[PDB]
Amino acid sequence: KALFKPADVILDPKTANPILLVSEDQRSVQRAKEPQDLPDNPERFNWHYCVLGCESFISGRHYWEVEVGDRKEWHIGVCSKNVQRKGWVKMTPENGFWTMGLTDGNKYRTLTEPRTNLKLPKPPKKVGVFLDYETGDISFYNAVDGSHIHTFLDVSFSEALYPVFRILTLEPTALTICPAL
Amino acid sequence: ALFKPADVILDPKTANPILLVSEDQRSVQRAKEPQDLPDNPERFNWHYCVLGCESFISGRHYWEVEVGDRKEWHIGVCSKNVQRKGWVKMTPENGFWTMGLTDGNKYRTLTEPRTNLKLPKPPKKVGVFLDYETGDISFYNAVDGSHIHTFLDVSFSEALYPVFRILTLEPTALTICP
Amino acid sequence: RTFLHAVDVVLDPDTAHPDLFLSEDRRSVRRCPFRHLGESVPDNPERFDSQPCVLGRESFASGKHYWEVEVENVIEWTVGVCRDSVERKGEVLLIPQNGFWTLEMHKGQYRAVSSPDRILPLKESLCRVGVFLDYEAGDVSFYNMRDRSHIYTCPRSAFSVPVRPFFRLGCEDSPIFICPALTGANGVTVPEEGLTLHRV
Amino acid sequence: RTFLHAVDVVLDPDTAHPDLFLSEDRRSVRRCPFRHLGESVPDNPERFDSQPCVLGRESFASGKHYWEVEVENVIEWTVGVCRDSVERKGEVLLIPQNGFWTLEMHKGQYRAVSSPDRILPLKESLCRVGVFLDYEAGDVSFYNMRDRSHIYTCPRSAFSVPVRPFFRLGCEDSPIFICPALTGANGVTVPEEGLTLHRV
Ligand SMILES: C/C(=C\COP(=O)(O)OP(=O)(O)O)CO
Ligand SMILES: C/C(=C\COP(=O)(O)OP(=O)(O)O)CO
């Protein structure tokens, strides 16, 4: 644990799909009912309901924590700087995304090819994300009871990696980064 | 002869893309689907209309149109400044003085409102007479000389073109007698 | 400008007469008479106040556009298109002269342009009606979407200003539904086997 | 480019398998096998030579597009979307990896992406089927147009090249019809009282 530097992760509004609302403090993200009137600048995801952090990882060991609370739909992890941001692409390691999450309230998945269903004994409310750049590892943990959720050992170690967050649903609970602390 | 016979040639720059102007610019037919032509200002982009090349600014003129047994056609004259872009109702108040045939046997004058005409015989050839100064336009069966309709005492403020309109895809073309 | 646009019609709540009750998604509406009884309703120049009408938020100044409306089990209703400039406060006849192009159900009859002199001889009860607009053509047309058969085209009209989808209910607690445009799997996870029989 | 396009689909006779018999308007098709008996049919590169298929003449490289097909009383049919570049020659497999996205009726059942492992549990006979494309979404969806209900969305795919309407007939003397886009009174005199129950 101690080997993993807490990352200070802030959402980059220039990257957020127009249907996303980034809080003023750049820590939380909700969905709008309908897309907002924003420029389609090159940084922005124009199809996937995604937003990146401002800072990318290029070396070292890093940790951040995400409050998912009782949200019924969310996906998080990292993605390469060079991912396709315009039009649908499958969010999988081969297209530069390393993400997992929840759909339909109780169906936890790893977003790989093909998708697999994850066994979670407890619904997590807080997810810890551990990245070891050099060993191409990203691991997901229940940040409350410390239990393991899923690991990728095939993360790029040649591309800058952004934290990435995705929400499809319109619901009360935001998705919130716990600030470096 | 009281009217100078006009030499009317169809202006393909004015023809709706769905109309086919013959090689010699004296006859017009309908295509199955619009051709790919530019939307130059002169072209009728909605009504299935085509103008003559020459407009009338004074004097007395006539021309004759073979309608054949075509089940649908309207002809007459219109003002230079009529709306060529989008539908406008073809009426004197919008700059159109026209009459013709719809649905095999129903003759009308394109007045506001339209008026049904009672034609003893169906004409295969129609004569159009214009007198700019009085403001008269008249239609006649050109084979047997019967009257069809006259617009009386109009106050023309614009050059007038011969105008031709066909909606239906039929074998009988519409042809200007030279 | 050559494409037929299948419009996604969402109702504008600022136009809606106070007795109209909109669904949360603003794609369906019923009339609940005197539902503001004992209330003071605020002034709103966009709101229809003499007749129970509501507009689509979309406005059209050119092009060809259509949408579909489910009217099964409503028997006092009016649909079509109106100018954005129509009278909202006083009661007008819902006719082309006043900026309305409509198909009406009234006392068990289908009336073109809301006219007692334009009874449509239909031989079946309409369940889904297509409202078709061709701005440049001066064309508002109505279709029976059972067999996609033409019902009526209004006398051609110079719309001249932007026009809007128009809805009115003359009757109580029976809703009309405005059919959303098809979206496929927009906003949804498609599993790698496909998405089977999706329901909202 | 956010607009749903209601496509006017016309079949491309150059793609058509020689057993297919197109209507002259090219909006309907039936299969009459050995109808070129004793004839040498030119085998141009665009033509399907074994699969009894025909493409729409339209191709799509972006945006949202749909069309409707009448399939009532046809016991063997396929509809959908295919890449402009699909293999035309031999017994090509009509699957996504070969650039085909289909819904099929085969032996009284409905099958997605022409797969025996993807039988769709519909509770009614399809009569009018909607075919929907969202190019940037990788989306081909099918709809039951009786109630506009979702049937199936294929696995999301990178189309990569232009795609076209796809049709297959696996039975004889049973025509499918492609529903023309609505056109209102386009090409027709509207009387001053309106046009009533136009038929062609
Ligand atoms: C609509 C949407 C995402 C769904 O993507 P997909 O349909 O590719 O599914 P998955 O990535 O497996 O959840 C917006 O980000
Ligand atoms: C479709 C068409 C014209 C019909 O115009 P209208 O529908 O205004 O009828 P009419 O009374 O014949 O002038 C194309 O020129």
Interacting residues of D42 by C-beta distance below 8 A, sequence separation 6+: none
Strand A61-67 versus strand A5-6 pairing type? parallel
**CA geometry: angle C141, C142, C143, nearest 5 deg:** 125
Q: Which protein residue has the closest C-alpha to ligand 2 atom 6?
A: D189
One-character DSSP codes across A123-148: --SEEEEEEETTTTEEEEEETTT--E
- Half-sphere exposure in the Cβ direction for A153 (13 Å, CA): 0
Q: Percent helix, strand and coil across chain B, each rounded to 5?
A: 0, 40, 60
Count structural domains, chain D: 1
Spacing, Cα D181 to ligand 2 middle (Å) = 21
**In this structure, how many other beta carbons lie within 10 angstroms of the beta carbon of residue A50?**
24
| Residue B20 Cα to chain centre, angstroms | 15
**In this structure, how many other beta carbons lie within 10 angstroms of the beta carbon of residue B82?**
18
Residue in this structure with the two tokens 């029989």, named with its chain if needed:
C197
**CA geometry: angle B62, B68, B74, nearest 5 deg:** 60
Interacting residues of D186 by C-beta distance below 8 A, sequence separation 6+: C134, C137, C139
Examine residue B34 and say whether the peptide bond preceding it is cis (omega within 30 degrees of 0). Answer: no
**E strands in B27-95:** 27-30, 49-51, 60-66, 73-79
Tokens of B99: 């009459």
Burial B18-52 (b: 16+ CB within 10 A, else e): bbebeeebbbbbbeeeeeeeeeeeebbebbbbbbb
Instruction: Identify the CA nearest to A179 among candidates A76, A62, A64, A71.
Output: A64
CA dihedral of residues C94, C100, C105, C110 (deg, nearest 10): 110
| Residue A96 Cα to chain centre, angstroms | 13
CA dihedral of residues D109, D112, D115, D117 (deg, nearest 10): -80
Tokens of C26: 């603003």
Provide the chain C residues 158-187 that lie in CB contact (below 8 A) with chain B: 158
Cα separation, D50 vs D139, in Å, equals 27
**CA geometry: angle C62, D143, A105, nearest 5 deg:** 105
Alpha-carbon Rg for chain C, nearest whole angstrom, is 17
The answer to whether B109 and B89 have CB atoms below 8 angstroms apart is no
* Closest-lying ligand 1 atom to the alpha carbon of residue C188: 1
- Residues of chain B in contact with residue D188, where contact means CB-CB under 8 angstroms, are 167
User: Is C119 a member of any domain?
Assistant: yes
The answer to whether B129 and B110 have CB atoms below 8 angstroms apart is no
Sign of CA dihedral A85, A91, A97, A103: positive
| Residue A139 Cα to chain centre, angstroms | 12
One-character DSSP codes across A92-116: SGGGTEEEEEEETTTEEEE-SSS-E
The residue type found at D11 is L
Maximum alpha-carbon separation in chain D? 58
**Domain of residue D130, CATH code:** 2.60.120.920
| Residue B29 Cα to chain centre, angstroms | 14
Cα separation, C98 vs C85, in Å, equals 9
Instruction: Identify the CA nearest to B121 among candidates B67, B165, B75, B169.
Output: B67
D66 touches chain C (CB under 8 A): yes
Cα separation, C151 vs C132, in Å, equals 11
Residue of chain D nearest C157, judged by CA positions: D192
| Residue C144 Cα to chain centre, angstroms | 14
Contact partners for chain B, using 3 or more CB pairs closer than 8 A, are C, D
Tokens of C180: 């959303």
User: What are the start-end ranges of the H helices in chain B?
Assistant: none
Residue of chain B nearest D25, judged by CA positions: B32
Burial class of residue D87, CB neighbours in 10 A (0-12, 13-18, 19+): middle
Cα separation, A117 vs A138, in Å, equals 18
Give, for C197, the enclosing helix (H) or strand (E). Answer: none
**At CB < 8 A and 24+ separation, what contacts does D192-196 make?**
D192/B113, D192/B114, D192/C155, D193/C118, D193/C155, D194/C112, D194/C113, D194/C118, D194/C152, D194/C153, D194/C154, D194/C155, D195/C150, D195/C152, D195/C153, D196/C112, D196/C120, D196/C121, D196/C151, D196/C152
Provide the chain A residues 79-138 that lie in CB contact (below 8 A) with chain D: 86-90
D144 beta partners: D129, D149
Strand, helix or coil at C37? coil
Instruction: Identify the CA nearest to C74 among candidates C145, C174, C177.
Output: C174
* Closest-lying ligand 1 atom to the alpha carbon of residue C192: 12
User: Is C197 a member of any domain?
Assistant: no
- Half-sphere exposure in the Cβ direction for D166 (13 Å, CA): 31
Residue in this structure with the two tokens 């993605």, named with its chain if needed:
A79
C96 — phi, psi (to 5°)?
Answer: -55, -40
Maximum alpha-carbon separation in chain A? 43
Question: Range of A87's domain?
Answer: 5-178
Q: Which protein residue has the closest C-alpha to ligand 1 atom 12?
A: C189
Burial D143-178 (b: 16+ CB within 10 A, else e): bbbeebebbbbbbbbebeeebbbbbbbbeeebbbbb
Question: Range of D31's domain?
Answer: 4-179
A181 beta partners: none
Burial class of residue C89, CB neighbours in 10 A (0-12, 13-18, 19+): exposed
Tokens of A58: 């290029």
One-character DSSP codes across C66-122: EEEEE-TT--SEEEEEEETTS-SSS----SGGGTEEEEEEETTEEEETT-TT-B---
User: Is D156 a member of any domain?
Assistant: yes
Tokens of B154: 């109009």
Cα separation, B175 vs C19, in Å, equals 61
**CA geometry: angle B17, C156, B90, nearest 5 deg:** 60
Instruction: Identify the CA nearest to D184 among candidates B86, C114, C156.
Output: C156
Report resolution (Å) to 1 decimal: 2.2
Cα separation, B147 vs B129, in Å, equals 11
Cα separation, C57 vs D45, in Å, equals 49
Instruction: Identify the CA nearest to C84 among candidates C141, C139, C161.
Output: C161
Cα separation, C140 vs C154, in Å, equals 6
C140 beta partners: C133
Cα separation, C182 vs D68, in Å, equals 12
Closest ligand to Cα B49: 2
User: Is C109 a member of any domain?
Assistant: yes
Count structural domains, chain B: 1
* Closest-lying ligand 2 atom to the alpha carbon of residue B47: 15
Cα distance from N-terminal residue to C-terminal residue, chain D: 33
Residue of chain D nearest A85, judged by CA positions: D136
Question: Are A and B touching by the rule of 3+ CB pairs within 8 Å?
Answer: no
Instruction: Identify the CA nearest to C6 among candidates C172, C154, C192, C165.
Output: C165
D97 — phi, psi (to 5°)?
Answer: -65, -25
Interacting residues of C169 by C-beta distance below 8 A, sequence separation 6+: C20, C29, C30, C31, C52, C74, C76, C77, C176
Cα separation, B145 vs B27, in Å, equals 23
Maximum alpha-carbon separation in chain B? 43
B32 — phi, psi (to 5°)?
Answer: -70, -35
Subunit contact B48:D187, Cβ cutoff 8 A: yes
Cα separation, C58 vs C11, in Å, equals 9
CA distances for C32 relative to C35, C46, C92, C173, C174, angstroms: 6, 20, 22, 6, 9
**Domain of residue A147, CATH code:** 2.60.120.920
Interacting residues of D200 by C-beta distance below 8 A, sequence separation 6+: none
